From a paper:
AlgU (also known as AlgT or σ22) is the key σECF of [name].
The final structure was refined to 1.9 Å, with Rwork = 0.1729 and Rfree = 0.1929. The concave sheets from the two domains present an open and accessible cavity to accommodate the periplasmic domain of [name]. In agreement with the RseAperi–RseB interactions, the [name] helix element αI (residues R157–S177) acted as the major binding element during [name]–[name] coupling. First, MucA145–158, corresponding to the structure-unsolved RseA159–168 segment, exhibited an αβ turn conformation and formed antiparallel main-chain hydrogen bonds with the βO of [name]. Second, in contrast with the invisible RseA190–216, MucA181–191 adopted a helical conformation (αII) and bound to [name]-NTD. Comparing RseAperi–RseB and MucAperi–[name], the MucAperi αII inserted into the inner cavity of the [name]-NTD and a highly conserved proline P112 (corresponding to P112 in RseB) underwent a large dihedral angle transition (φ = −92.1 ψ = −4.6 in [name] compared to φ = −62.3 ψ = 149.8 in RseB) that allowed MucB92–113 to flip to the surface. The MucAperi–[name] complex structure had a polyethylene glycol (PEG) molecule bound, which may be incorporated during crystallization.
Residue numbers in the entry:
A (entry chain B): 145 to 191
B (entry chain A): 22 to 126, 127A, 128 to 201, 211 to 313
Write the structure that this text describes.
């Protein structure tokens, strides 16, 4: 979501294109990991 | 431990009860409501359907742990390979990493419950307040708490009809539900975290391979991503979405540097320490 860091040749722009995707991947993956819980699903749905 | 007994009970509740219910999931910036239909078949297999009730019609159907179908919005970042369920919830070893204690009684969704505190034995993970249904052992309410005891997320049933098996019509999905080793390691993990998956993906923006590692302690999970920098001087980054932290740290290497991103439902410090500890495998 809101990517945060500043002023050292490391644009948020570089991070912006990546971080949200990686975040989504972790959450979604947790959702389909086979756990009996509805909670990982809920987290993924919240995105 | 009676607390251990409750956890054991929670662990098998899924296979011993058929039910329907509605629940809320809330975190900073998100409030959503969902429906669940769960039937234990005559052979003991679990068939379950989850449906988002507000906003878009997100949905998943699972049959004995496998995802039968899943809405697009829930799976855009999953390759079919990733469709594996790594594991079954096992509470047996959880006591090593968390202190389990019954702390009271409550009433949730009109049902009596016992309150189980799941307290971290260290600073590397988050605790839970679990309200377990007396009749079935199902989790009526789950609160994820940070170090300061602050609420990171709320999962709570508003209505739960137990015993009763959902009809076949209810288990059926809508059309929105779509029918469906890496050379890196961590030199530090918090106690009880273990590698659950390892795979390669492509960078979202360049042709580069990105290494993916997933770790879990039985309750919490974090994922690690290692992406080549090709000599770019990119600095660190941080984010948070409810209980999920994101930390990115540059790793100096002999191959142009790498960006190491750690994402998970763990404290910021833990993610940061892990990110700093990722190393390439050596010849
Ligand atoms: Ca189970």
């Amino acid at each position: 979501p809101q990517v945060i860091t500043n002023s050292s040749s490391s644009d948020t722009r570089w991070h912006e294109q990546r971080l949200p995707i990686y975040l989504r991947q972790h959450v979604q993956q947790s959702a389909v990991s086979g756990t009996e819980s509805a909670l990982p699903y809920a987290r993924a749905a919240s995105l | 431990a009676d607390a251990s007994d409750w956890l054991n009970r929670l662990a098998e509740a899924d296979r011993q009860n058929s039910f329907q219910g509605t629940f809320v999931y809330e975190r900073n910036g998100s409030f959503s409501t969902h429906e669940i239909w769960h039937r234990v078949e005559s052979d003991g297999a679990v068939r379950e359907r989850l449906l988002q009730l507000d906003g878009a019609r997100q949905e998943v159907v699972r049959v004995d742990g496998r995802t039968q179908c899943i809405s697009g919005g829930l799976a855009d970042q999953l390759a079919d390979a990733q469709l594996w369920p790594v594991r079954k919830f096992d509470p047996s070893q959880l006591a090593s990493w968390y202190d389990l204690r019954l702390v009271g009684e409550s009433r949730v969704a009109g049902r009596p419950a016992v309150v189980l505190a799941v307290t971290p034995r260290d600073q590397h993970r988050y605790g839970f307040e679990l309200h377990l249904d007396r009749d079935t052992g199902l989790p009526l309410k789950s609160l994820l708490l940070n170090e300061k005891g602050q609420l990171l997320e709320r999962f709570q049933f508003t209505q739960l009809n137990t015993g009763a098996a959902p009809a076949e019509d209810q288990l059926q999905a809508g059309a929105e539900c779509q029918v469906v080793t890496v050379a890196w390691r961590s030199e530090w993990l918090p106690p009880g975290f273990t590698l659950t998956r390892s795979f390669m993906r492509r960078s979202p923006v360049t042709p580069d391979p990105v290494a993916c590692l997933t770790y879990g302690d039985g309750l919490a999970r974090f994922s690690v991503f290692i992406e080549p920098l090709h000599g770019a001087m990119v600095g660190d980054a941080r984010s948070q979405l409810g209980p999920t932290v994101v930390v990115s740290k540059r790793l100096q290497t002999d191959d142009g540097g790498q960006m190491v991103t750690v994402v998970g439902e763990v404290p910021l410090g833990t993610a940061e320490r892990v990110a700093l500890s990722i190393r390439p495998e050596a010849a």
